[PDB]
Ligand binder design. Structure first.
Ligand SMILES: COc1ccccc1OCCNC(=O)c1cncc2ccccc12
Ligand SMILES: COc1ccccc1OCCNC(=O)c1cncc2ccccc12
Lengths: 304, 304
């Protein structure tokens, strides 16, 4: 028992981390096979950042200007190309530590592990969610660009995120591994509206099921609700509307606990309307939305 | 910016994880050099667990009875010995992936990363603290025994914990890597008093400094206090007494923020006496005590 914000083991990803330097800027790259992927803003200086013309800036750079270092050894760059907001540096050596991997575009509300890196060196690993507004509430400092988010299924690493910038609001924005930003964000130093965020309702319900599995049951009540009634409450409290697809994804947890999804919705409705009254659930004094139903079952079943 | 419950990258530790089977019991072992370390209860059946005579049970076992598998390959056991509550299985092959490492006994209130494992395979990594009462609030299921806790300084892994059991209360107990239990716990299936836990005051203060560094400042007030006055409040709220050694450890964060330690104590006193009033600090609705002053500076400085 016990329920923690558990990240995937970061080993397979640590072996892919490299340092990429261009001019005076250094950030992290992801070395998979004979390609190094990094944020395209590695080619910017500081006068550039307000509105960079990436095409023009990249034209001034040659393969030899991209310094790629994997631990203590230098990689030879034999090609460079820009795909959306990422640079793809072809190197002459395939990474011997390349795990089985895929590039995936995650959906808002899904979770992933982030391996925070500086100068191509891993400093820490944490679990987070892609917010409904396509920002991530990460922990990143100067030099963390190129740090990636991922999920792992047995031996396959599904890379879903590459860190690009921190918005003036202190939340983080980045791309999928094809360089497409999640959300409306652009790789420019300008004020960018993140847009209204909501709480990931299906995740809160999954976490409420995790609480019951792990002994915390004080919030269970004698009530039930309908999807429509629950969604009126979800709207008032800036929660995402619950759909039957979400009820269906919660099926396994409902069967495990014997608590119907709509019955758990009525518990959540009561917690939203009455608060926690100074109590806690799984060591938290607020409703947690960074665990998916899959994460709850994975953590409660011990999938390696 | 941003502040997360960040774990150390688990790669160096993943490379040490093996599966140890003895009779019908399978758990995890830690393979460092030519030694595999695992909990001694691997030799117990089920009738044994209520009060095992470990010496007698081990006498019936021979080197060939300990099956040690590292991924897909079998390790040859050439020696076995019991040191406190751990078994040390000498193998004929030194682990090629052995990182630089030390075995350390952590102090209560200190933090560490746990790599949860099942069948010698890593499933996840999370950060936690050794509670003042020498339990850990982990996330462990059947088969997680032998999973370890550690800290990493540059290239050196300091192993501090090996998981042994879950108490009837749902909290976890284990040993240092010499097999000495943290706390009064014994490796028997009996009810064991964990003893009164307290909140790690120096850690809450460190986390309050992290909040200020990351923009959350609503809790800063116009007050100050003395160590004696603060400790009367800490006693009432089951917080550990703050000592000058704790004030000294908070020195760097006090200099960084320009907020005197006793001034931050007065903020903490007010939060303890008035609660949060429905507000949050670093995404938490309670006072967090699982970040040490060293962790706060490490996360806020990007040490790799
Ligand atoms: C506004 O910056 C950019 C805009 C567009 C494109 C790139 C921008 O950044 C480039 C450098 N950024 C970082 O290294 C950074 C990343 N995350 C967290 C941080 C926290 C404090 C200081 C810096 C960072
Ligand atoms: C009372 O058990 C023991 C007592 C003394 C010595 C050993 C004991 O356990 C041996 C097996 N234990 C585990 O595999 C275990 C570890 N953590 C979390 C769990 C959650 C649910 C079920 C089992 C576990």
């Amino acid at each position: 028992s016990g329920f923690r914000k558990m990240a995937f083991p970061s080993g397979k990803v640590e072996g892919c981390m490299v340092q990429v330097t261009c001019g005076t800027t250094t950030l992290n790259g992801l070395w998979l096979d004979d390609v190094v992927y990094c944020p395209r803003h590695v080619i910017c200086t500081s006068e550039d950042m307000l509105n960079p013309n990436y095409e023009d800036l990249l034209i001034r750079k040659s393969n030899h200007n991209f310094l790629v270092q994997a631990g203590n050894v230098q990689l030879r760059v034999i090609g460079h190309s820009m795909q959306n907001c990422v640079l793809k540096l072809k190197v002459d050596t395939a990474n011997p530590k390349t795990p089985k991997y895929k590039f995936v575009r995650i959906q808002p509300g899904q979770t992933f592990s982030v391996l925070a890196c500086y100068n191509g060196s891993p400093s820490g690993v944490y679990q987070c969610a892609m917010r409904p507004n396509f920002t991530i509430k990460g922990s990143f400092l100067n030099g963390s660009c190129g740090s990636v988010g991922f999920n792992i299924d047995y031996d396959c690493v599904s890379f879903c995120y590459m860190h690009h910038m921190e918005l003036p609001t202190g939340v983080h924005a980045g791309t999928d591994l094809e360089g497409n930003f999640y959300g409306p964000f652009v790789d420019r130093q300008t004020a960018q509206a993140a847009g209204t965020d909501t709480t990931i309702t299906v995740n809160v319900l999954a976490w409420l099921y995790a609480a019951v599995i792990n002994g915390d049951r004080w919030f269970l009540n004698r009530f039930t609700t309908t999807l429509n009634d629950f969604n009126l409450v979800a709207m008032k409290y800036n929660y995402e509307p619950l759909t039957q697809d979400h009820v269906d994804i919660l099926g396994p947890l409902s069967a495990q606990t014997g608590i119907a999804v709509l019955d758990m919705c009525a518990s959540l409705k009561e917690l939203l309307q009455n608060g926690m009254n100074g109590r806690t659930i799984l060591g938290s004094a607020l409703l947690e939305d960074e665990f998916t139903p899959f994460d709850v079952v994975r953590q409660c079943s011990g999938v390696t």
